Amino acid sequence: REIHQDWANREYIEIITSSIKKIADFLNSFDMSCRSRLATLNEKLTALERRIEYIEARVT
Amino acid sequence: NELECVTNISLANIIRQLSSLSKYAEDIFGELFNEAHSFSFRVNSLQERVDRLSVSVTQLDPKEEELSLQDITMRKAFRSSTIQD
Amino acid sequence: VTLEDALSNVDLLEELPLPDQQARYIEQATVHSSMNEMLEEGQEY
Amino acid sequence: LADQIFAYYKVMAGSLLLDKRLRSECKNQGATIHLPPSNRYETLLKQRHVQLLGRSIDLNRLITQRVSAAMYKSLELAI
Amino acid sequence: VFNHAIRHTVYAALQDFSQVTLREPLRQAIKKKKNVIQSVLQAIRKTVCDWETGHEPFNDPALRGEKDPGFDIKVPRRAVGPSSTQLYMVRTMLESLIADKSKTLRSSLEGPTILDIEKFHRESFFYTHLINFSETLQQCCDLSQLWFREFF
Amino acid sequence: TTQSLASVAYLINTLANNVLQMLDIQASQLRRMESSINHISQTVDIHKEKVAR
């Protein structure tokens, strides 16, 4: 009866929504990790730029 | 009200949510890519400078090196960057 | 073109390495709905 | 935060290298040179994506800038 | 994990109640002249029953009135919660059965029947809140008002 | 709806992979350039010590 099909459809929608929220959570986590390692790379680059400034000032 | 109408409306709603998610994901990825591109520019500039400095350093002459005793202080001192956000 | 493929896509998407991260009742229902709508409008004001 | 972090670590460095026998002697005459209280700054120094109003703030970078300025000031003052 | 667990438990509890627990009072009411209880119990079954074969069992003796010989029915499982409308309808109809004022529908009911109805009605209170776990988690931890100062 | 979900997931996965590889390449470049800069510093120090001697 229509109620049975209704239960089936609601279960379908529930599965799809769960998948969508999994995708969103992955997006958030990936963004956080990328921020962290970008900060690290930037710091490393900054440490290197200052060092080359100092060296080339010492050699001239 | 027939239930199938509600289910179809909900399916359209989840597709709209998918589109919104696509836009938000694009926003995040662009925010990452812009600063990554900036890092790439900085790395290329530093690589050029390092190549120049290496070829310059390989030809330093110690025996010809001469130091001016008289000019020890009238020379301008080296100062490191002091940028503070 | 099936739930299996979409679910597999999501699963494979959720495993990338991410380190460095740390009757008498229908009328009652109708009146109740209208009263709730009035409540939300009142909150807006 | 940067000011007090630098002060804390400078005090710890100064306390580590102080003669131990001198500390003992001073305590034996009621003139104790008190130790610096321990404190928990490690978690703050490791922060790199603090979240505020949609911005991501690298706390480590700013603390480094301030602390490096302070270290330069200390060396200049010594000389 | 909480969403899946909550939906599964809600569906299981609702279906167990509806299909297994409401057989005894319905049999009693069929064996009796009173039909208001029968109409209400039957109405509750149409609302929230998911017959795993699509139709209610036909050779059920409890529906007829005769005592069970037994008659195991396999209750289905799945992670999906009842729509708001039907959960609300079910809760209001249960409240109607166990009501001090209604010549009372609670007078006809036996002891254990009302005791179990009161139970389920009490636990079903938080189903709506828990199905929306994220929104309720947001609400339970709201400390926004510590900043605003319009009154002062 | 099934097609949309699958396609969006696929696209997001590909972007994430590309960004990951890009970051790793940049980190490798910086490690290599750090090594070279350290070598240059060592050479400059050697030269200065020779001049002093």
Residue of B nearest to F30 (CA): B43
Q: How far apart are CA A44 and CA D61, in angstroms?
A: 11
Give the closest of C3, C10, C20 to A23, CB-based: C10
Name chain A contacts of C18, Cβ cutoff 8 Å.
29-30, 32-33
- In this structure, what token pair is assigned to residue B84? 């503070």
**Distance between the two ends of chain C, CA-based, in angstroms?**
48
Q: Which subunits have 3 or more CB–CB pairs within 8 Å of chain A? A: B, C, D, E, F
Which of B26, B16, F8 has its CA nearest to residue C13? F8
- In this structure, what token pair is assigned to residue A30? 């990936």
- Provide the shortest C-alpha distance from residue B26 to chain F (in Å): 9
DSSP strand pairing (D55-57 vs D50-52): antiparallel
Given an 8 Å threshold on Cβ–Cβ distance, is A4 in contact with E79? no
Under a CB-based contact definition with an 8 Å cutoff, are residues E3 and E130 in contact?
A: no
Q: How far apart are CA F50 and CA A43, in angstroms?
A: 33
Q: How far apart are CA A25 and CA E134, in angstroms?
A: 13
- Provide the shortest C-alpha distance from residue A55 to chain F (in Å): 7
Give me the half-sphere count of Cα atoms (radius 13 Å) on the Cβ side of residue D35.
6
Residue of A nearest to B16 (CA): A20
Residue of E nearest to A1 (CA): E54
Residue ranges of alpha helices (H) inside C1-45 are 3-13, 24-44
Say whether residue B25 is in contact with chain A using an 8 A CB cutoff.
Answer: yes
Beta bridge partners of D55: D52
Residue of A nearest to D61 (CA): A43
Best to test chain A binding among F26, F45, F49 (most A CBs inside 10 Å): F26
Q: How far apart are CA E88 and CA E90, in angstroms?
A: 5
Which of D69, D50, D59 has its CA nearest to residue D3? D69
Q: How far apart are CA E10 and CA A47, in angstroms?
A: 57
Q: How many CB pairs under 8 A join A and C?
A: 26
Residue B41, number of CB atoms within 10 A of its CB: 9
The chain D residues in contact with chain B (CB within 8 A) are 61-62, 65-66, 69, 72
Beta bridge partners of D51: D56
- In this structure, what token pair is assigned to residue F49? 């010590």
Beta bridge partners of E100: none
- In this structure, what token pair is assigned to residue E26? 């319905």
Q: How far apart are CA B5 and CA B13, in angstroms?
A: 12
- Provide the shortest C-alpha distance from residue A59 to chain D (in Å): 22
| Residue D50 DSSP SS3 | strand
Residue E106, number of CB atoms within 10 A of its CB: 17
Mind spelling out the 3-state secondary structure of E86-147? Answer: HHHHHHHHHHHHCCCCCCCHHHHCCHHHHHHHHHHHHHHHHHHHHHCHHHHHHHHCCCHHHC
Rg of chain C on CA atoms, in Å:
24
Give me the half-sphere count of Cα atoms (radius 13 Å) on the Cβ side of residue B45.
11
Distance of CA D60 to CAs D41, F14, F43, Å? 12, 31, 32
Cβ burial of F6 (10 Å; 0-12, 13-18, 19+) is buried
Question: What Å resolution does this PDB entry report?
Answer: 3.0
Given an 8 Å threshold on Cβ–Cβ distance, is A7 in contact with E55? no
Q: How many domains does chain A have?
A: 1
Best to test chain A binding among C9, C13, C18 (most A CBs inside 10 Å): C18
Residue ranges of alpha helices (H) inside chain D are 2-16, 20-28, 42-45, 59-78
Given an 8 Å threshold on Cβ–Cβ distance, is A41 in contact with F9? no
Given an 8 Å threshold on Cβ–Cβ distance, is B10 in contact with A34? no
Host domain of residue A9: 1-59
Q: Which subunits have 3 or more CB–CB pairs within 8 Å of chain D? A: A, B
Chain F residues 9-28 with CB within 8 Å of chain B: 11-12, 15, 19, 22-23, 26
Q: How far apart are CA E66 and CA E7, in angstroms?
A: 35
Q: How far apart are CA B44 and CA A56, in angstroms?
A: 17
- CB within 8 A of C2, min separation 6: which ones? F2
- Provide the shortest C-alpha distance from residue A19 to chain B (in Å): 11
Helices and strands, number each (H, E), in chain B: 1, 0
- CB within 8 A of E30, min separation 6: which ones? E38, E62, E63, E64, E65
Host domain of residue B33: 1-62
Name chain E contacts of C29, Cβ cutoff 8 Å.
85, 88-89
